[PDB]
Amino acid sequence: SSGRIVQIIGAVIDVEFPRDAVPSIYEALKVQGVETTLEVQQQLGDGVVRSIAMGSTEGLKRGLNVDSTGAAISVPVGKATLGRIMDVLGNPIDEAGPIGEEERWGIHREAPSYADQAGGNELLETGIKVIDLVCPFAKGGKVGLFGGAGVGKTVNMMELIRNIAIEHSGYSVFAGVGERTREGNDFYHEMKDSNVLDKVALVYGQMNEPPGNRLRVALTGLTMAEKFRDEGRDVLLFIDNIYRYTLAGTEVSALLGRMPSAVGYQPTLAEEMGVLQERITSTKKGSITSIQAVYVPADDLTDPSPATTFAHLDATVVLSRDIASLGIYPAVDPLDSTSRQLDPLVIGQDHYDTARGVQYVLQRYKELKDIIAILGMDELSEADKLLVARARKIQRFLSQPFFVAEVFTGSPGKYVSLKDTIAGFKGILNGDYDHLPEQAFYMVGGIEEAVEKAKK
Amino acid sequence: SSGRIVQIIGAVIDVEFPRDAVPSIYEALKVQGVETTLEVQQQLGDGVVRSIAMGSTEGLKRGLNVDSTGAAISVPVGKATLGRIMDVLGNPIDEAGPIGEEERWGIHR
Amino acid sequence: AELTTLARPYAKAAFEYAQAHQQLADWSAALGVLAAVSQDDTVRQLLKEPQLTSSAKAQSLIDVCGDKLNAPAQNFVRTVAENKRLELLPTIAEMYEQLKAEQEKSVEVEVTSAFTLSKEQQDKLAKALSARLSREVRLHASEDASLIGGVIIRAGDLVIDGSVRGKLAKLAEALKS
Amino acid sequence: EISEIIKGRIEKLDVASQARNEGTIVSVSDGIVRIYGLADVMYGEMIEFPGGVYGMALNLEQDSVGAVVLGEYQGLAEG
Ligand SMILES: Nc1ncnc2c1ncn2[C@@H]1O[C@H](COP(=O)(O)OP(=O)(O)O)[C@@H](O)[C@H]1O
Ligand SMILES: [Mg+2]
């Protein structure tokens, strides 16, 4: 049957239906005079349901008629989504006409079972020195890029999109959850001009959008990736910012009648994160390699949202504002960043010992910072002086000019193999480069280029 | 018209007035038979206003009569205020007699 | 807070006065009239107006009921209005009847079957329930084609299911679990 | 069921009909106003008060409308 709007407060709307026709949780509803879509969140009793609007509520009023659709928000899936741009409800937003869909899938699903899990450990080379050394990625695994405002999350993601597509031959799915509309336009035209667009599905719900859109766009993109995984394919799933899915949930939580938790967050923070994160996994049918940018509120890694995200990832890349301030890009922190693949049984003893050696030197240099700041380097022991000199070279050799960062500086981009990465850091640890000047390691790709830069 | 005290909680006093005589926000009210001035802060509805007492509430009780003054706290202004000590309501706290005022102005503008 | 939580003090006060003065049937009629009259589309509107006083709302409701409210019942309506509780009148009447039924050792039992049952069967179910519950039973018999066969008994919060639909559901859960 | 004599008494009652575009103020506090009866008001609509003052509709509830005053609220009163 149909119901009537009884209350409106921002993005949240209450609708009353006959007692024998009350709609189900997550069921989609449509307002008769404007065609605005609503998603049911809870049943309040007496035939009243509470819902979130999937669009603007300006101009809506009490007493308007509402139609129940009998199902959840359903989006098109399969080959017809490749090279197309869609919104949260699966409508095309690229002016290229209707989607030639064969079937539609509901955006709400349970995670794959414990018996469906995949045990993959195959190494994925990124061509970026710091990542390949201390944060080795794996095919079918999950990666997270943590960082404050303006430190490198989008630039480091655009560089990873460029490098992984060299070896990967399958499809990709990109979900834009609460970020800049200009960056979605730049990425679409870049792929269209490069002829890469026919193998990528694009979904957007940017910062300009109301809370309901930003809250469900992640589910729409993941539903398209799950169709390709379940077809037996190996696909890439990229998320512009997973924190926006949680934040859109915070804006609406008090309107849903929930008591707040620590620092104003919704009481359901960890469950809302687990329900989405557990679906983003590889199975015995096919694989999903996923990369996500994670905003860190006010540079605080102990904040409830970032703190709850670390347990859902295989590789954690932590960006720092202190490192970015020195000039080093990518601004990765070797001591805070880590990966499940950093194991002697997965990467071999040579890589493992080189990575452990780099971390030991950088940790010891971090302990001397206060002594060096008050008394200077000259008071240190003959052993500490040599270690600090190698720490400064290692810290500079971790830098690398990117093929997407060329517009910012002018310098050409560099791709460094895992073999060249291990050889350079092993030589600096052994002392094979103790004679070269500290500035020769800054922005040079492979170790041989540091030898040529020292000639000037 | 006049209102009645309905609730007293420290310095906060709620006063009930007839529906056609509810006093405005910031209006000054006088308690009958006691030298106590109340400033209206909020209109709660049902003819009830919430106010703050400009002095001690000790000895007050529910049901005392209150009179509206028609304006905000109005204080003496001009030449007569020079060389004098006054309280928040413009009363002469010095033992020098009444202020030779020619005009009074409301404190809110 | 449920409406039942707010109506409890008022329903209990009305019941104890009616019981002590031997007026149980008078208050049963008075509360029923107030519950029905306050739900009328014109009276429901009048009671929600922000310009009317509690005494004006009470007097208007008393003048409309008139003959059906004795002096105690009129005093009760003026008490419910002063405390701003006129929206609870339908719940107060419902809770008063529950206190009355429990006092008068009476139980209203709903009954449903696939197809009609004889007076011989109703009187056999009635004596069995009255012997189990130790109360007077009033069987509100009815039919529901959703049942494949048999009958279901609902004596308030207590339910006794002897229907074929319940047995088929037990089998579905036994095989699925 | 309500009786025909009582239904006749109900039809005689002094119940004021209110237009769907008009309302009455219930309360005023710190630039926020509560209004009773604006049945056809839209979320984000401009509300007109006496003396040239305007409000914006933010909370549309079952029994009342919550509005934020687009200027000085100290001249607004209950009723
Ligand atoms: N690899 C890099 N090389 C040079 N500058 C960089 C690099 N990464 C980031 N920056 C600088 O930092 C700015 C912000 O980077 P961006 O990726 O947009 O940050 P975030 O997405 O974390 O807010 C860039 O516009 C640029 O000036
Ligand atoms: Mg950016």
Alpha-helical (H) ranges within A298-441 are: 304-309, 321-326, 344-347, 349-375, 382-397, 406-409, 418-430
Given the residues A109, A180, A199, A364, the one annotated as active site: A180
Identity at A426, one-letter amino acid code: K
A100 to A88, A228, D40, D50: CA distances (angstroms):
18, 16, 41, 57
Q: Tell me if there are at least 3 CB pairs under 8 Å linking chains B and A.
A: no
CB A340 within 8 Å of CB A141: yes
Contact C101, C107 (CB under 8 A): yes
Q: What distance in Å separates the CA atoms of residue C140 and residue C152, rounded to the nearest whole number?
A: 12
CB A50 within 8 A of CB A14: yes
Annotate A58-82 with DSSP letters as a single string: TT-BTT-EEEEEEEE-EEEESGGGT
| b/e sequence A160-180, b meaning 16+ C-beta within 10 Å | bbbbbbeebeebbbbbbbbbe
Name residues whose C-beta falls within 8 Å of residue A310's C-beta, 6 or more positions apart in sequence.
A144, A316
**Start-to-end C-alpha separation, chain A:** 80
End-to-end Cα, chain B, rounded Å? 25
Closest CA to D41 of D29, D59, D54, D26: D59
Backbone CA torsion sign across A309, A311, A315, A316: positive
- Cα separation of A21 and A19, whole Å? 6
Inter-CA distances, C104 with A106, A424, C7, C12, C33, Å: 56, 95, 21, 15, 22
Residues with CB under 5 A from ligand 2 (ion): A 154
Structure tokens at D57: 């509709």
Candidates B22, B25, B40: best to mutate against D (most CBs of D within 10 A) is: B25
- Taken in order A49, A50, A54, A57, the sign of the CA dihedral is positive
Residues 6 or more apart in contact with residue D76 via CB below 8 angstroms = B25, D25, D28, D33, D49, D53, D69
Contacts 24+ apart (CB under 8 A), B39-43: B39/B72, B39/B73, B42/D27, B42/D28, B42/D29, B42/D30, B43/D27, B43/D28, B43/D29, B43/D77, B43/D78
Contact D33, D27 (CB under 8 A): yes
Instruction: Please state whether beta strands C106-113 and B65-72 pair in parallel, antiparallel, or not at all (unpaired).
Output: unpaired
Q: Which atom of ligand 1 is nearest to the CA of A400?
A: 1
How distant, in Å, are the alpha carbons of C125, C129, C154 from that of C118?
Answer: 11, 17, 19
Burial of B21 (0-12, 13-18, 19+ CB in 10 A): exposed
Q: Which of A261, A222, A267 is nearest to A110 (CA)?
A: A222
Q: Is A153 assigned a catalytic role?
A: yes
Residue C35: strand, helix, or coil = helix
**Distance between CA atoms of A346 and A121, rounded to whole angstroms?**
7
Residues in chain D: 79
Q: Is the Cβ–Cβ distance between A429 and A393 less than 8 Å? A: no
Measuring CA to CA, which residue among A226, A234, A230, A238 is closest to residue A202? A238
Of A27, A39, A179, A272, the active-site residue reads A179
* The amino acid at C165: R
Question: Which-ligand-closest: CA of A183?
Answer: 2
Q: Which two tokens stand for residue A428?
A: 């600096």
Residue A200: closest CA among A170, A223, A177? A170
Residue with CA at minimum distance from ligand 1 atom 3: A329
The answer to whether A90 is a known ligand-binding residue is no
Pairing of strands A85-86, A48-53: unpaired
Closest CA to A332 of A285, A390, A402, A262: A402
DSSP lists the bridge partners of residue D46 as: D56
Rg (CA), chain A: 25
- Rounded Cα distance between C8 and A115, Å, is 54
A151 marked ligand binding residue: yes
Question: Exposed e or buried b for every residue in A431-454, given b needs 16+ CB within 10 A?
Answer: eebeebeeebbbbbbbbebbeebb
Rounded-to-integer distance, Cα C166 and Cα A370, Å:
76
Residue bearing tokens 């005589």: B21
Distance from CA of B71 to the nearest CA of C (A): 25
Q: Clarify whether A179 is annotated catalytic.
A: yes
Q: Structure resolution in Å? A: 2.0
The reply to whether B70 touches chain D by the CB within 8 Å rule is no
| CA A155 – ligand 1 centroid, Å | 6
Which stretch of DSSP H or E encloses residue A37? Answer: strand A37-45
Contacts 24+ apart (CB under 8 A), C52-57: C53/B19, C54/C81, C54/C82, C54/C84, C55/C81, C55/C82, C57/C81, C57/C86
The Cβ of residue A248 has, within 10 Å, a number of other Cβ atoms equal to 26
Q: Determine the Cα–Cα distance for residues A312 and A271; give it in Å rounded to an integer.
A: 12
Residue B72 CA, distance from chain mean position: 8
What the block records as the tokens of A97 is: 């006409």
Pairing of strands A200-205, A172-177: parallel
**Sole residue written with tokens 């006088």:** B30
The residues lining ligand 1, judged by C-beta closer than 6 Å to any ligand atom, are A 147, 149-155, 329-330, 402, 405, 408
Among A113, A168, A407, A432, which Cα is nearest to A290's? A168
Identity of residue A16? E
The three-state secondary structure class of A412 is coil
Taking contacts as CB-CB distances below 8 angstroms, the residues of chain B near C53 are 19
Query: Distance (Å, rounded) from C-alpha A450 to C-alpha A397?
Result: 9
- Separation between Cα atoms, residue C167 and residue C171, nearest integer Å: 6
Query: Under the phi-then-psi rule, with left for phi > 0, alpha for psi from -120 to 50, and beta for the rest, what region is A134?
Result: alpha
**Using the beta-carbon criterion (under 8 Å), do D61 and A57 form an inter-chain contact?**
no
Tokens of A306: 């970032």
Whether omega for the bond prior to residue A330 falls within 30 degrees of 0, making it cis, is yes
Ordered DSSP codes for D7-27: HHHHHTS------TT--EEEE
The residues, any chain, with a CB within 8 Å of residue D72's CB and separated by 6 or more, are D53
Nearest ligand to the C-alpha of residue A319? Answer: 1
Q: How far apart are CA D15 and CA D9, in angstroms?
A: 12
At residue B74, φ and ψ (nearest 5 deg) are -110, 120
Question: Which residue do the tokens 């190996």 mark?
Answer: A234
Residue A291 exposed, middle or buried by CB count within 10 Å (0-12, 13-18, 19+): buried
- Count of Cβ atoms closer than 10 Å to residue C21 Cβ: 11
3-state class of C74 per DSSP? helix
Q: Out of A398, A408, A409, A414, give the residue to mutate to test ligand 1, the one with the largest number of ligand atoms within 8 Å of its CB.
A: A408
Phi first, then psi: give them for residue A6, nearest 5 degrees: -110, -25
Cα angle A239-A245-A247, degrees, rounded to a multiple of 5: 130
SS3 A248: helix
The alpha carbon dihedral of C76, C79, C85, C86 has a sign of positive
- Which residue in D has a C-alpha nearest to residue C66's C-alpha? D6
Q: How was this structure determined?
A: cryo-EM
What is the C-alpha separation between A54 and A13, in angstroms, rounded?
A: 11
CA distance C57 to C59: 6
Please say whether the beta carbons of B3 and D58 come within 8 A.
no
